[PDB]
Amino acid sequence: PAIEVGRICVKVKGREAGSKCVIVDIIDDNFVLVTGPKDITGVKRRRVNILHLEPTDKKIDIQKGASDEEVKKKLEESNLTEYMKEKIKIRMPTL
C-alpha cells in the first residue's frame, strides 16, 4: 500500500510511540496529513514525514484535503468504533 497513500498508519519508535492514525494528504512532498480519535488513541490531526512510515494493509480512497469533520467521517470508513481502539502498548495512560 506504501506505493500510494489512502491508508492507515501506526507510530513506531521506542519509549511510548504506538498510536494508530489515518493518512489523508500530500503536503510539500515528503509530509502527509494524519488523524486519529483524540478521545481514545489521543492523536487528533497532525503532519508526519515519510522518514517515519508504518503502513498497514487497507483501502485506498481520499478526496484529498478533507476538513476535520469530513476527516472524522472518513475514520468510520476505517471502522474505528471497535475494529481498532487497540491500545498499541499496554503501557500508555496510568503507566
- Half-sphere CA count of 37, side-chain side, radius 13 A: 15
Classify 67 in phi/psi space as left (phi over 0), alpha (psi -120 to 50) or beta: beta
Identify which of 10, 20, 24 has the alpha carbon closest to the alpha carbon of residue 70. 24
CATH fold of 1-86: SH3 type barrels. (2.30.30)
Q: How far apart are CA 84 and CA 9, in angstroms?
A: 12
What's at 52, amino acid-wise?
Answer: H
Experimentally determined by = NMR
Sign of CA dihedral 57, 58, 63, 64: negative
Three-state secondary structure string covering the chain: CCCCCCCEEECCCCCCCCCEEEEEEECCCCEEEEECCCCCCCCCEEEEECCCCCECCCCCCCCCCCCHHHHHHHHHHHCCCCCCCCCCCCCCCCC
The full set of domain ranges for the chain reads 1-86
